[PDB]
Symmetry: C3
Subunit: 147 residues, 3 copies
């Protein structure tokens, strides 16, 4: 008897808190690389397990350790509320993804490895090292019950 | 016989010669780290030994070598003439202080290790590798007793 | 049937496609280096072998491998269409040159090593360590005799 329900909370802004806007080149911050969108050996209807905030190395494989951390995936195809991207790609297909590399302020709490685990402290060094600011200073919000 | 005197030389903008104004995140250039303000072992009211321009690592320990250089202490509590913070703290307590990290131009001549010695030619790479321009072309100033 | 003919091809802004300008400094992207202009063997009246887009190390030696790339030489003395410095510097002299290091979007098709060889894929890593973008998405151009 379970009711069919859908949910949506959070936006792209919550991932990219801040950004340096280079006057001479608006694209100075982003590197575009190709990754496997639909998982391999899966049905055309198998929704991809790629989500905003997954760390990916410059090669394109999602990062499972501090070693492979190069950037943050912010592609417009994997933002919250993007649902109808089903079957438009074949298994094992490689399609371009956009990544943010340098000159950004990132939300510490939402960066996650390929498995979804939060970024290790040793991994934060890679992001901090190159361009970016990683900060967990977030206000949060209260909805109901919590006066 | 030792007439009490005080001196002021330099200020905040005399170290951070230039800054890249990040849009949206105005704190893109700075980090906050907890540091031991009053020495762990010292008199209850001994002034802290920290001075502006001292190199500091990621954990807040003053950098004694190029290996531990991460940033430059910039916080307002250590600027010249801010001695009114004496006695407030207690030995062994750690207090946050702002550090400068990236996107800045730094006056080399005022960067010194914890011991007060001048920055090393190897440690300069760490600061420059962070996205900063360490420079030496400073006009300087000359006072009475110099022919101009 | 021989006539004295001269030609000009390019510009300065096709190497540094974009640049981030800092409020504090308009010159924190670059670095000035001491470079040898005329080799120690070629007589005084001979053209220099450098060109805009040659990768150089910090010590001023033109880059020969991906492990030594530090910046791109974009000084205004070697821009295309100048050609008036022949014989002004005797062999072995050392002259300052303006390198471009940080905060740039750099063309790849014009970057080259010491001998003119194109930039290796593993040499892009060194140049992006300074925080720059190496982009190949250049429309190019096509002159008379071509369709479109």
């Amino acid at each position: 008897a379970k009711a069919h329900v859908a949910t949506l909370e959070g936006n792209y802004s919550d991932i990219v808190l801040g950004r340096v806007v280079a006057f001479g080149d608006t694209g100075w911050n982003f590197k575009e690389v190709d990754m496997t969108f639909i998982a391999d050996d899966a049905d055309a209807d198998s929704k991809t397990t790629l989500f905003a905030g997954v760390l990916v190395g410059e090669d394109g494989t999602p990062a499972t350790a501090a070693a492979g951390v190069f950037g943050v995936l912010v592609d417009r195809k994997v933002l919250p509320g993007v649902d109808h991207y089903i079957g438009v790609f074949e298994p094992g297909e490689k399609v371009p993804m956009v990544l943010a590399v340098r000159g950004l302020t990132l939300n510490q709490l939402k960066l996650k490895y390929a498995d979804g685990t939060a970024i290790d402290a040793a991994g934060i060094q890679a992001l901090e090292a190159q361009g970016n600011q990683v900060t967990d200073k977030i206000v949060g919000t209260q909805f109901i019950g919590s006066v």
